[PDB]
Design a protein around this nucleic acid. Structure first.
Lengths: 49, 48, 195, 110
DNA sequence: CGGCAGTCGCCGTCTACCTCTCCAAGAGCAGCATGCGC
DNA sequence: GCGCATGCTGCTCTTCTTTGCCATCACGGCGACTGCCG
RNA sequence: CCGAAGCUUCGGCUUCGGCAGGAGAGGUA
């Protein structure tokens, strides 16, 4: 959803005929969310061995 | 919390000694008041 | 610029509001730049100038009425010309009947703006009649009109700099004996408020 | 069409101006938002011929825009990628407060 | 004016000790350094 | 041979709060308050 | 305050070097 908001907001400020799917997409929010879940979270717990 | 107050005070001083319109000075004064209030008690009014 | 301590205004109760006799919502609006307040208003000039003031605004209102009836006369002669050029001959008289109805609509439309102007003048007069310190005045346009038409005889602003002025022009003794008089001979809930 | 003041992040004023012009020309609303300008000065910052002028901002963080306030111009202008919000809003912040004739004149003169 | 009842916010909710992990980053503004062109 | 242009790189901040984002928050006691009905 | 090194009259003197906050989860009495 964060990436979708970014692409929707940036689709209206760039010039046409130079718009490609690779120039509208930002990966940072997704990796940030993934690394925030798998790290500082209350449900992904340190294993007891 | 100290740095925020110092930055707002410096911007207010520079804008006052420049001949700024009243609306902008009022906005800066409101923002300085909010910053000091957050310094003394964070979360009492508005959002933390 | 002066600021206000959070402890003495955002408490339960508000010690600043208890000292100044102001609702906490009024304090919050004044402090955070959302409404004006009257710090001081001079009275002797009002008392010795009311007659001239009333004369000036009566003259202005009558001039507005004179302009309005001037437009009425111009539109009346235009409508008379239209009726003369239309009603007398084979031109559609149904159109002129609905034109008469729309003409009545036109008096109503012009009296709308006339009433707007008259109401603005009379409510400015009403506000200037009843103006006391520590009275919050919303609708900033009224403040511009008051501060330009009768800019003297009173002062006020918004922010903590305008509350410092209210605190400085404060008399502890008079309010103290006033509260003690209210408690001595009184009942209901105003006695509870005084307590 | 009265002038209005918009608050943006510090250092993003020129980018906000460019993006707002682009969204004026692209989204479609061209008869609502007319002109934008960032008040600025060109101080004499020089060093032995080698000029070093950093664009002198008289009001850092503010942008001037001429616009007719409908309920869609407020939406398009406020959601530009970089502005924080409108200024001058009083009385529950229903609508922003316009500028003054002489004030706009003197700011647009320099 | 004068009661009046819902409502909304603010206060509080046991002691001592052990082990582990994780704690703003991308964007932006100059300031040059070297390559390329006439 | 000299001037202009663009990328390594010092270098010091900057990070909001609408018509959005945001999703909620026990349980009891207490006290103002505030619109509301009479 | 500790260490290293010199002077040391044996009381000490001189040079250099050096730091310790939050959030979350699980557990024992």
């Amino acid at each position: 959803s964060r990436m979708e908001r970014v692409v929707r907001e940036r689709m209206t400020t760039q010039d046409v005929e130079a718009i490609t799917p690779q120039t509208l997409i930002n990966i940072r929010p997704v990796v940030a969310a993934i690394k925030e879940f798998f790290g500082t979270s209350q449900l992904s717990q340190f294993m007891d061995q | 919390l100290y740095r925020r107050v110092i930055n707002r005070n410096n911007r207010l001083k520079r804008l006052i000694d420049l001949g700024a319109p009243e609306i902008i000075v009022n906005n800066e004064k409101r923002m300085l008041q909010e910053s000091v209030d957050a310094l003394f008690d964070n979360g009492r009014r508005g959002r933390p | 610029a002066p600021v206000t301590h959070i402890w003495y205004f955002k408490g339960v109760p508000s010690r600043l509001g208890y000292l100044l006799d102001l609702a906490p919502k009024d304090l919050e609006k004044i402090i955070y730049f959302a409404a004006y307040v009257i710090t001081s208003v001079d009275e002797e000039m009002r008392h010795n100038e009311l007659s001239t003031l009333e004369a000036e605004m009566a003259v202005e209102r009558k001039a507005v009425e004179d302009q309005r009836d001037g437009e009425l006369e111009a539109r009346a002669q235009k409508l008379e010309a239209d009726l003369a050029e239309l009603e007398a001959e084979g031109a559609k008289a149904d159109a002129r009947r609905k034109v008469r109805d729309g003409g009545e609509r036109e008096m109503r439309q012009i009296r709308d703006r006339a009433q707007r102007e008259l109401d603005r003048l009379e409510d400015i007069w009403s506000t200037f009649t009843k103006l006391a310190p520590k009275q919050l005045i919303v609708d900033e346009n009224l403040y511009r009109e008051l501060v330009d038409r009768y800019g003297e005889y009173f002062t006020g602003a918004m922010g903590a700099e305008s509350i410092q002025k209210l605190i400085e022009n404060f008399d502890i003794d008079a309010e103290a004996e006033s509260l003690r008089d209210v408690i001595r001979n009184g009942k209901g809930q105003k006695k509870l408020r005084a307590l | 069409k009265n002038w209005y003041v918009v608050h943006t992040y510090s250092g993003y004023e020129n980018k906000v101006k460019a993006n707002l012009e682009k969204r004026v020309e692209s989204m479609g609303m061209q008869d609502k938002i007319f002109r934008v300008v960032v008040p600025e000065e060109e101080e004499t910052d020089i060093k032995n011929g080698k000029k070093k002028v950093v664009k002198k901002k008289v009001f850092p963080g503010y942008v001037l825009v001429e616009i007719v306030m409908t309920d869609d111009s407020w939406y398009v202008v406020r959601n530009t990628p970089g502005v924080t919000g409108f200024v001058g809003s009083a009385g529950s912040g229903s609508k922003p407060t316009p500028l003054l004739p002489g004030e706009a004149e003197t700011i647009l003169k320099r």
